[PDB]
Amino acid sequence: AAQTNAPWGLARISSTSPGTSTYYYDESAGQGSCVYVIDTGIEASHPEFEGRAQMVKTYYYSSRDGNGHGTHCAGTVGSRTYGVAKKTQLFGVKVLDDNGSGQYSTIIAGMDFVASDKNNRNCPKGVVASLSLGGGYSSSVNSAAARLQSSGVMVAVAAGNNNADARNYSPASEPSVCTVGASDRYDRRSSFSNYGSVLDIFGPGTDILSTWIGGSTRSISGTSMATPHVAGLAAYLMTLGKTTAASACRYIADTANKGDLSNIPFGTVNLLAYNNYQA
Numbered sequence: 145a146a147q148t149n150a151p152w153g154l155a156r157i158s159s160t161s162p163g164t165s166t167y168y169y170d171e172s173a174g175q176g177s178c179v180y181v182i183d184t185g186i187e188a189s190h191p192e193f194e195g196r197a198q199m200v201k202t203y204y205y206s207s208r209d210g211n212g213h214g215t216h217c218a219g220t221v222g223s224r225t226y227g228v229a230k231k232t233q234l235f236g237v238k239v240l241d242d243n244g245s246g247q248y249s250t251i252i253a254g255m256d257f258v259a260s261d262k263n264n265r266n267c268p269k270g271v272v273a274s275l276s277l278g279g280g281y282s283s284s285v286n287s288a289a290a291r292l293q294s295s296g297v298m299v300a301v302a303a304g305n306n307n308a309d310a311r312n313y314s315p316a317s318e319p320s321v322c323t324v325g326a327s328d329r330y331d332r333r334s335s336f337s338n339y340g341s342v343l344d345i346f347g348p349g350t351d352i353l354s355t356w357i358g359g360s361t362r363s364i365s366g367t368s369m370a371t372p373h374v375a376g377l378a379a380y381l382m383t384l385g386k387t388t389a390a391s392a393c394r395y396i397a398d399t400a401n402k403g404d405l406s407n408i409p410f411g412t413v414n415l416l417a418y419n420n421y422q423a
């Protein structure tokens with residue numbers, strides 16, 4: 145399948161070079177997989193989700209996304225026009241309030257919730273969790289991410305936007321999950337992207353067009369935007385049978401575009417998510 149005039153990020157993950165505008169992907173498109181978006185919520189009624197999204201848990205007064213961040217990330221995972229895995233099932237867990245903030249205790253509870261909840265869902269091709277959030281180092285937050293990964297969920301987390309070593313941020317610094325940095329359309333490390341040895345992979349993160357609340361769209365930037373590219377790619381590859389939840393991050397790194405990125409500090413991987421599609 146081919147989506148013409150795709151958002152640059154989708155085109156980038158199906159090409160060995162920057163500057164293309166078509167997203168090439170297998171028609172299976174993540175069908176039979178499930179992705180939990182742990183964030184500010186998801187506007188599930190947005191036409192772009194085609195009924196494939198639903199809220200399953202909130203830690204606040206409402207399950208509504210009053211911010212937009214979660215809806216944007218969800219859109220990059222699996223919306224029709226802006227998504228990597230266009231037929232995946234999306235589950236929203238609202239651990240962030242409508243200002244985009246959340247206590248570590250709530251974020252941890254949300255991770256433990258997903259580890260349990262997945263046992264009540266029909267996700268024959270596997271389960272992914274996308275965490276476009278983070279803050280200062282916390283061994284408790286790292287431990288929760290490790291548990292979620294251990295339980296059989298492919299965990300993808302944002303490296304953070306501090307232009308610093310991700311070792312001082314959580315859950316970015318948990319080695320057992322998939323830690324994602326951001327690149328721009330010219331294959332540069334995004335100027336805000338964290339780096340360091342704990343990074344596993346880079347994905348598109350600057351000027352990413354996706355769904356927004358009020359049935360709208362908008363373009364924003366961050367490692368929060370790169371993370372759902374990788375989460376969606378994992379769901380896509382699991383549906384194809386190429387990899388499993390335990391090994392998807394490694395498979396993605398193994399099959400990535402290597403050495404294409406500029407402004408990568410010594411000691412950080414130069415690996416850009418790539419779906420290796422061939423018609």
Ligand SMILES: [Ca+2]
Pocket residue numbers: 160161401404
């Ligand atoms: Ca290349």
Ligand SMILES: [Ca+2]
Pocket residue numbers: 318319320321322323342343344393
């Ligand atoms: Ca890792």
